[PDB]
Amino acid sequence: GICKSSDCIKSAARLIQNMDATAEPCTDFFKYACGGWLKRNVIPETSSRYSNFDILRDELEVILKDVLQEPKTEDIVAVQKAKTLYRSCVNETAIDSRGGQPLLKLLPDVYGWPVATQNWEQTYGTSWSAEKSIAQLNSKYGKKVLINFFVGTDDKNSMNHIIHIDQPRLGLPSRDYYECTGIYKEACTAYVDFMIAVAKLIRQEEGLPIDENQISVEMNKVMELEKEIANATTKSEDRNDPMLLYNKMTLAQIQNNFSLEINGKPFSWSNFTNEIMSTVNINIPNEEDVVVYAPEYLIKLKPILTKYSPRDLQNLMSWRFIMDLVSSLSRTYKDSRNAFRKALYGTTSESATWRRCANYVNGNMENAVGRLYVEAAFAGESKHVVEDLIAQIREVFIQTLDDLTWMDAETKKKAEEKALAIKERIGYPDDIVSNDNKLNNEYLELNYKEDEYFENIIQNLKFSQSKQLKKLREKVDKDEWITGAAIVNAFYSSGRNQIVFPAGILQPPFFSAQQSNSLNYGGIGMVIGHEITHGFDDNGRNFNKDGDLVDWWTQQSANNFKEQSQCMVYQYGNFSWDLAGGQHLNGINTLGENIADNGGIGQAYRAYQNYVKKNGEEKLLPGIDLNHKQLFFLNFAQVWCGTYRPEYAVNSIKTDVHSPGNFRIIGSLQNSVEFSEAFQCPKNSYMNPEKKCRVW
Numbered sequence: 076g077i078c079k080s081s082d083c084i085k086s087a088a089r090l091i092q093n094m095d096a097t098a099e100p101c102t103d104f105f106k107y108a109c110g111g112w113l114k115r116n117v118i119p120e121t122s123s124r125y126s127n128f129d130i131l132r133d134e135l136e137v138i139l140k141d142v143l144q145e146p147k148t149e150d151i152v153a154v155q156k157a158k159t160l161y162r163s164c165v166n167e168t169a170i171d172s173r174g175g176q177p178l179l180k181l182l183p184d185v186y187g188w189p190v191a192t193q194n195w196e197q198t199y200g201t202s203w204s205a206e207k208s209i210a211q212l213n214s215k216y217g218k219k220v221l222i223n224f225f226v227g228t229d230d231k232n233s234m235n236h237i238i239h240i241d242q243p244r245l246g247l248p249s250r251d252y253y254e255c256t257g258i259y260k261e262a263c264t265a266y267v268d269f270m271i272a273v274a275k276l277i278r279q280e281e282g283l284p285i286d287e288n289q290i291s292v293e294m295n296k297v298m299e300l301e302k303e304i305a306n307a308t309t310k311s312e313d314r315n316d317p318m319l320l321y322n323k324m325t326l327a328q329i330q331n332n333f334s335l336e337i338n339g340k341p342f343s344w345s346n347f348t349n350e351i352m353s354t355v356n357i358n359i360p361n362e363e364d365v366v367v368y369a370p371e372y373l374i375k376l377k378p379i380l381t382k383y384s385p386r387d388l389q390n391l392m393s394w395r396f397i398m399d400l401v402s403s404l405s406r407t408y409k410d411s412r413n414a415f416r417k418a419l420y421g422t423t424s425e426s427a428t429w430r431r432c433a434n435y436v437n438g439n440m441e442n443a444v445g446r447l448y449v450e451a452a453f454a455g456e457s458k459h460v461v462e463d464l465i466a467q468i469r470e471v472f473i474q475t476l477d478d479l480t481w482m483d484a485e486t487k488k489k490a491e492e493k494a495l496a497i498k499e500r501i502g503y504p505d506d507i508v509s510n511d512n513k514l515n516n517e518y519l520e521l522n523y524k525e526d527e528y529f530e531n532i533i534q535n536l537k538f539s540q541s542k543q544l545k546k547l548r549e550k551v552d553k554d555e556w557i558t559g560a561a562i563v564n565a566f567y568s569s570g571r572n573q574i575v576f577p578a579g580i581l582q583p584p585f586f587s588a589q590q591s592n593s594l595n596y597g598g599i600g601m602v603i604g605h606e607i608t609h610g611f612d613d614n615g616r617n618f619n620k621d622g623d624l625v626d627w628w629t630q631q632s633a634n635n636f637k638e639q640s641q642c643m644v645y646q647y648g649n650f651s652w653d654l655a656g657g658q659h660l661n662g663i664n665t666l667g668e669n670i671a672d673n674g675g676i677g678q679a680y681r682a683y684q685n686y687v688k689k690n691g692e693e694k695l696l697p698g699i700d701l702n703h704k705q706l707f708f709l710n711f712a713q714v715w716c717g718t719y720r721p722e723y724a725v726n727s728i729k730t731d732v733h734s735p736g737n738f739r740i741i742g743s744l745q746n747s748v749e750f751s752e753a754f755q756c757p758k759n760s761y762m763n764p765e766k767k768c769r770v771w
C-alpha cells in the first residue's frame with residue numbers, strides 16, 4: 076500500500092529533503108519540518124527573504140521570461156504592448172547610454188529638486204505652492220507626500236467610491252526607524268548619504284558646481300523635517316479598528332478642523348483636492364463628503380510645517396519622488412542606492428534585470444500577462460476541484476459555529492449569514508483568455524516605445540492614477556478582479572466579501588491532482604480556511620455580508636471576541652525572533668493574520684477528517700515513516716518554510732502584518748489539539764502548551 080509513481084517520488088523527496096528528522100517535532104516543529112530546507116536553500120544574494128513562497132515566485136518569473144522575451148506573429152495588440160514594454164526594460168545598453176537624462180528632463184514637472192537646481196527660488200519659487208506640489212506628485216505619479224489623498228471604496232457604502240485623506244508613508248520602512256539608534260542606526264546614515272550622493276550625481280550631470288558641505292546641510296534638514304513628520308504619525312497599533320478610523324466629514328469641515336500654515340500662507344484644502352481631481356476633470360465642491368483616516372496626524376502637522384521653507388519642503392517631497400526612480404536609470408544611479416538597499420534588506424545587489432522587468436510588466440499589465448501565464452502553465456481542470464474544497468471548508472466554518480460557546484445565538488446566525496454570502500474567485504478571469512477585444516481595449520490608450528523604458532514607466536504611473544481618480548463618480552465594478560492571475564498568493568476582500576485564489580498559488584506544495592489529499596488539505600485547504608476566516612478577524616468582523624462597515628455583533632459577543640483574541644495578542648507578542656536580534660513580534664499588528672492562520676488550519680483539518688471518513692485512507696508515501704494525519708501538518712508547515720536576512724527581519728517585524736513563517740507554524744500548532752494528537756505530544760511540551768488560544 077505505497078505509492079510508486081514519479082509524482083509521488085518527488086513529492087516524498089521534497090518532504091524528506093525539507094524536514095530534519097533528528098529534531099523532535101513536539102519541541103520545535105519548525106526545525107522538524109523545515110530544518111533540511113534551511114540547509115538546502117541558502118538565501119540568494121539578491122533576496123532579502125527566502126521561502127517556499129519566494130521560490131515559487133522566482134520560478135514563475137522564469138515562465139514570464141519565456142512568454143515575454145520572444146515576439147510572435149499572431150500576438151494580439153495587448154500582448155505586443157506587453158512584450159514591447161518588457162523589451163524596453165531589459166535593454167540595459169539603451170538605459171545606460173541615457174545616464175540620468177530621463178529624470179533630469181522630467182524634474183521640472185514636480186517643481187524640481189532645490190538642492191540640485193542652479194537657482195530654485197528664481198526658477199520655481201514664484202509659482203510654487205504646497206497644494207500644487209503635493210497634488211502633482213499624487214495625481215501624475217502616485218507619490219504620496221505629506222498628505223495622502225486617494226479615491227477608494229466607501230467603507231460604509233461598498234458600492235460607492237469616495238475621497239480618503241490619510242497620513243502618508245515615509246522614506247524609511249516605518250516611523251520607528253527615525254529614532255536612528257541601535258538597530259536603526261545604519262539605515263538612517265545610509266538614507267542621508269543616499270540623498271547626498273544622488274544630489275551630487277544630478278548636479279554633476281547638469282554641469283553645476285559641487286558644494287559638498289552645502290548639500291549636506293540641505294539633506295540633513297530633509298531628515299530633520301521627516302523625523303518630525305514620522306513622530307507626528309499615528310502608530311500602526313492604533314489603526315487596526317476600522318470603526319474608529321472612519322471619520323466622514325465635508326471638505327468645508329476639513330478646512331475648519333485641519334488648517335495648515337505654510338510659508339506664512341494658509342493651506343487651501345479646496346485648492347489641493349481640485350488640483351488633483353482636475354486631472355480627470357472632476358470638480359470637488361465644499362459640500363463633498365470625505366473620509367479622514369488620520370485626524371490626529373493632521374493636527375500635529377500644524378506646528379511642524381510652519382518652521383520650514385519652501386526649499387526645505389520641496390527638497391523632501393522631490394527626494395521621495397527621486398529615490399524610487401534612481402534604479403530605473405543608468406548604472407551609476409543604480410549604484411547610489413547600494414548602501415541604502417543593504418541597510419533595509421541586507422541584499423548586496425539588485426536582482427536580475429529580466430526578473431525585475433518580468434515582475435514590472437506583470438504589475439502593470441496583469442490581465443495581458445495573466446493570459447500568457449495561464450495558457451503556458453495553468454491546468455484549468457484544477458478550478459472545479461478547488462471549488463469543491465471551498466464548499467467543504469465554508470460548510471465546516473458554519474458547523475463550527477455550534478461549538479463556539481463565546482457567541483450568543485443571534486450573532487451565530489449573522490455569522491453564518493455572512494459566511495454563506497462569501498463569493499469565490501478561482502484561477503483567472505475568463506475574459507482575459509476568451510475575449511481578445513476586451514483585453515485589447517483595456518490597454519488602448521497605452522503606447523510604448525522600444526528604446527524608452529523611463530518614458531514607458533512615466534506613462535504607466537499617469538495612466539494608473541488617472542484610472543483610479545476617474546472612479547470617483549462611478550459605482551464599484553463587482554466583476555473586477557483584485558489580483559492578477561500570475562501571482563503566488565491568496566486574498567480576502569472586506570469590501571466585496573470575497574475570497575480569491577489566483578492560478579499562481581494552485582501548485583505544489585499547496586495543491587496538485589498528483590498530490591496526496593492530506594497534502595492538499597494541509598496546503599491550499601488551510602489557505603482557503605485562512606481567507607474565509609479573514610472575513611471574521613479583528614478587521615473583517617466589522618464588515619457585513621455585502622461589504623459595509625456596520626456593527627452586526629451583540630455587545631456581549633463583541634466583548635467575548637476581544638477577550639478570546641487577546642490571548643493571541645499575548646501569545647505572539649511573547650515570541651522573540653533571533654534573526655531580528657531578539658526583537659519581539661507585534662502581537663497587535665499581526666493579530667488578524669494570526670486569527671486567520673489559527674482558524675484556517677483547524678477548519679482544513681476537520682474538512683480533511685471528514686474526507687477520510689467518507690472516502691477511506693490514502694496510500695502511504697515511500698521513504699517517509701508518517702501517517703497522513705502527520706503529513707497534513709508536515710505539509711502545512713513546509714508551506715511556510717523560510718528565512719530572513721537580519722536587516723530585513725528588523726524591517727518586516729515592524730511593517731509586515733503577517734507573523735514570520737517560523738511563528739505562524741509554532742503559534743498555530745501550539746493552539747492545535749489535533750496537531751498534538753497526531754504527533755502524540757506530551758502536555759506542556761513546547762509545541763503543546765496546556766493553555767491554548769481559540770477564536771474560530
Ligand SMILES: *[C@@H]1O[C@H](CO)[C@@H](O[C@@H]2O[C@H](CO)[C@@H](O)[C@H](O)[C@H]2NC(C)=O)[C@H](O)[C@H]1NC(C)=O
Nearest residue numbers: 253254302303304305306307308371374375376
Ligand atoms: C513627537 O511629538 C510630540 C507631540 O506630538 C512631542 O511631544 C511634545 O514635546 C514638547 C517638547 O518636549 C513638549 O513641550 C510637549 O508638551 C509635548 N507634547 C506632547 C503631546 O507630548 C515630542 O517631543 C515629539 N518627539 C520628537 C522626537 O520629535
Ligand SMILES: *[C@@H]1O[C@H](CO)[C@@H](O[C@@H]2O[C@H](CO)[C@@H](O)[C@H](O)[C@H]2NC(C)=O)[C@H](O)[C@H]1NC(C)=O
Nearest residue numbers: 321322323324328329331332333367369370371
Ligand atoms: C472637527 O471639529 C469639530 C468642532 O470642534 C468637532 O466637533 C466637536 O466635537 C466635540 C467633542 O469632540 C463636541 O463637544 C463639540 O460639540 C463638537 N462641535 C461641533 C460643532 O460639532 C469634531 O469632532 C471634529 N472632527 C474630528 C474628526 O476631530
Ligand SMILES: *[C@@H]1O[C@H](CO)[C@@H](O)[C@H](O)[C@H]1NC(C)=O
Nearest residue numbers: 162166167168169170172526
Ligand atoms: C538596445 O538598444 C540599442 C540602442 O538603441 C540597440 O542598438 C539594440 O539593438 C537594442 N537591443 C535590442 C535587443 O533590441
Ligand SMILES: *[C@@H]1O[C@H](CO)[C@@H](O)[C@H](O)[C@H]1NC(C)=O
Nearest residue numbers: 206345346347349350351353
Ligand atoms: C489653486 O490656487 C491657484 C492660485 O490661487 C490657482 O491659480 C489655481 O487655479 C487653483 N487651483 C484650482 C484647481 O482651482
Ligand SMILES: [Zn+2]
Nearest residue numbers: 605609668671
Ligand atoms: Zn492573510
